[PDB]
Amino acid sequence: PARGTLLTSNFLTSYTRDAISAMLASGPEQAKCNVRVAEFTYATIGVEGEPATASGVLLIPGGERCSGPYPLLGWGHPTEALRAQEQAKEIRDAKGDDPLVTRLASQGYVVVGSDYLGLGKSNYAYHPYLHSASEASATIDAMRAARSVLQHLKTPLSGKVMLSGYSQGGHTAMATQREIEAHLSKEFHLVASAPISGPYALEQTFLDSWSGSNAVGENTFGILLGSYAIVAMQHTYKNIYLEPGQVFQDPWAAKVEPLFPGKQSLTDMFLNDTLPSIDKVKSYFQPGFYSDFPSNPANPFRQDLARNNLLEWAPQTPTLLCGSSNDATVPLKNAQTAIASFQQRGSNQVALVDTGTGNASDNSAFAHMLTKESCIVVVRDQLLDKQR
Ligand SMILES: CCCCCCCCO[C@@H]1O[C@H](CO)[C@@H](O)[C@H](O)[C@H]1O
Numbered sequence: 001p002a003r004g005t006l007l008t009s010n011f012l013t014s015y016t017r018d019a020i021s022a023m024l025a026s027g028p029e030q031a032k033c034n035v036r037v038a039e040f041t042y043a044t045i046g047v048e049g050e051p052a053t054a055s056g057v058l059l060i061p062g063g064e065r066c067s068g069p070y071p072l073l074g075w076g077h078p079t080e081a082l083r084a085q086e087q088a089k090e091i092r093d094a095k096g097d098d099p100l101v102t103r104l105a106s107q108g109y110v111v112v113g114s115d116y117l118g119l120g121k122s123n124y125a126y127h128p129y130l131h132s133a134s135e136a137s138a139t140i141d142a143m144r145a146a147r148s149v150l151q152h153l154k155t156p157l158s159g160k161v162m163l164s165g166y167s168q169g170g171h172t173a174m175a176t177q178r179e180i181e182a183h184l185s186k187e188f189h190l191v192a193s194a195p196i197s198g199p200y201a202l203e204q205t206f207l208d209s210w211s212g213s214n215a216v217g218e219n220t221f222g223i224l225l226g227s228y229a230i231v232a233m234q235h236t237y238k239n240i241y242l243e244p245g246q247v248f249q250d251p252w253a254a255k256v257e258p259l260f261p262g263k264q265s266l267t268d269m270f271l272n273d274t275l276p277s278i279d280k281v282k283s284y285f286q287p288g289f290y291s292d293f294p295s296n297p298a299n300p301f302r303q304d305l306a307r308n309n310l311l312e313w314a315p316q317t318p319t320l321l322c323g324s325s326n327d328a329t330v331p332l333k334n335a336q337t338a339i340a341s342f343q344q345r346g347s348n349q350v351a352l353v354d355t356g357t358g359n360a361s362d363n364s365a366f367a368h369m370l371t372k373e374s375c376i377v378v379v380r381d382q383l384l385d386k387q388r
């Protein structure tokens, strides 16, 4: 089947604008649109270009005071370690109380997000965590399938397309932006891109926080995120190890691969200390690997990270990188580094916005989860709204 072919689809539920405004008051801006929640599966490609399937979520706004046409916003979700997790069902289970619904779809934005290869109803054997090409291919094809759904429902689209995403989703959003701008500008009239708290300077991000802490603070969840990265990069490039023991010490070597993705969420793992805390990193990674990474640019894992940097290009679309200076998980430095190379490449289309407190006393790995909704609102108001 051609990339983007819609395989299955169906509505899960719907929320009235009043019901959405109630959520907002409870959590005050008012919703303007009702939000229909749909799910779907489509045909796409694997990391080698081979056929694969993936699932996705589609939020459709509607209502008397919300006539179209609507802009199409592609969305990249954050790091997901639970293999069976489906965004659409999560929103439905959350009773529609999700920023995608309360902050975007309720304001007239059609939202489409892929669960990514290896997650949700995807048939991929693993998830290519932080792999630019497949994060982009999965998102692009999700938007393709969603358009088929929308065309069948006669949903009026303006034709304008936009991108956004949080955490790993910020990486996804930017990777998609780059791919569309380089090859699909006709098919996708991209008018705005707003990556949120993403590791655009991927390799730099891991190097800067390799010891366990960075200029901002302690990268508390780094062992979980780095382990997911190592395992995923191994599945994709198969150049890191023959078996887990070359990188991880026992007893984790034999448990790490089934975890990413697996039966546990990142939160489960952190709370039950499935993996050691950053203070015991030297007891976690093998000594050879741990010292080779920061001292050898040819290190296999480091090369795989570099291959997924999103720095060497010139963005053409008005871009708003959002994050917080308090964020110690994904330093806002990522945005600065990105912007510096973009300009150095002739592009002045990318701006940066900080939602931090300004008090280094608020610096924490935990500030990362706060940028999701804070940045969705800011990015919507300062850029998306302007470009629709
Ligand atoms: C969505 C992208 C998130 C990137 C998070 C990077 C967090 C890096 O965190 C670091 O990881 C290293 C390797 O595991 C560890 O050695 C360090 O102790 C840890 O602080």
Ligand SMILES: CCCCCCCCO[C@@H]1O[C@H](CO)[C@@H](O)[C@H](O)[C@H]1O
Pocket (backbone or CB within 6 Å): 079, 167, 221, 266, 267, 270, 329, 366, 368, 369
């Ligand atoms: C970037 C991924 C980090 C995973 C480990 C930390 C998980 C912390 O738990 C998170 O706390 C947030 C509030 O602070 C909640 O909004 C999230 O639902 C919850 O999963």
